[PDB]
Design a protein around this nucleic acid. Structure first.
Ligand code: CA
Ligand code: CA
Ligand code: CA
Lengths: 161, 161
DNA sequence: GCAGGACGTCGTGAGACAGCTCCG
DNA sequence: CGGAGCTGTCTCACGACGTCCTGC
């Protein structure tokens, strides 16, 4: 399993060529709350260095999806989902620096997600942390995410609250 | 001094946001061989994360030059010269992946620098390793370096050989 | 004559997603 | 429905220097 200096390297790389992010995705097929909250970490690189992704994917138990070419000659590696992530993030957080907060927020969401699914109220708190993470991945001079505001309205103007 | 996972993190980050390069600089004031060979590693980042550079810089022994703003809102940290590098690289080499070759080429260069100085022949070998590093930092589809060819002819047409 | 630091930059290699599709 | 993998992209944030400037 994952060694320390192996975990700290990955953290160092993630912090440079990588991403920890959360998004609110539309779910027309759903019932009450028509949005699944997605969670991910990703590594990005020019396709010719793909084997270096392959590496970081092997050491991480081969969780996630390797892509030798998004299409624009860039290769990447995305790990979706609270399952992979509840196992991966904790190994990395201690060494993460730039994206530590983001990671700690992802876990935060993972710990709150279960009871948040069918509770429109507690789901708003969850969606807040989606704003926090996206915000973290912004310059302090850009528009700030607003899924929380844009969804409380859809909520109210629909009965759920 | 520099702890293992600390060096591993830095290796990971250097492999992502950083750079190990060598360049042949002209010196109109030098006597025979009017080129100093320059060696460096650097770390690049948006100026709102300077403290993470400050961090790495403190961790290395405060060697190098932090620059809160190059001028285009991007901050960077650059370590010039065999002296810092002969101290820093060895700590990083074991955890470097993508740029490990570059790092060794720099050490190799530092190893031959002394005798290469006033030997136009041995300077040409040392110049070849400069071509090799710049080459490493290139797609395999761009013009390849050749300070070697451009300096051989120069030497020849000037008597040095 | 030597070497270290500052200044500026062209050109992409990234980041952080939105949207799409598929799964049992 | 409930989650998870595949497709494509705008917009910058990097890389890898070249170039001028120091001081002794
Ligand atoms: Ca980066
Ligand atoms: Ca990179
Ligand atoms: Ca980068």
């Amino acid at each position: 399993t994952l060694q320390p200096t192996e975990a700290a390297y990955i953290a160092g790389f993630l912090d440079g060529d990588g991403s920890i992010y959360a998004k609110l995705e539309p779910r027309p097929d759903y019932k009450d709350i028509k949005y699944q909250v997605r969670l991910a970490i990703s590594f990005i690189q020019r396709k010719d260095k793909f084997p270096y992704l392959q590496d970081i994917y092997d050491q991480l138990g081969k969780r996630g999806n390797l892509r030798k070419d998004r299409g624009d000659g860039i290769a990447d590696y995305t790990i979706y989902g609270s399952t992979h992530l509840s196992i991966i993030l904790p190994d990395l957080v201690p060494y993460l620096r730039i994206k530590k907060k983001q990671a700690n927020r992802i876990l935060h969401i993972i710990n709150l997600y279960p009871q948040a699914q069918k509770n429109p109220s507690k789901f708003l708190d969850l969606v807040k942390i989606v704003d926090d993470v996206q915000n973290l991945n912004k310059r302090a001079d850009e528009l700030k995410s607003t899924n929380y505001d844009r969804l409380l309205e859809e909520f109210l103007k629909a009965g759920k609250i």
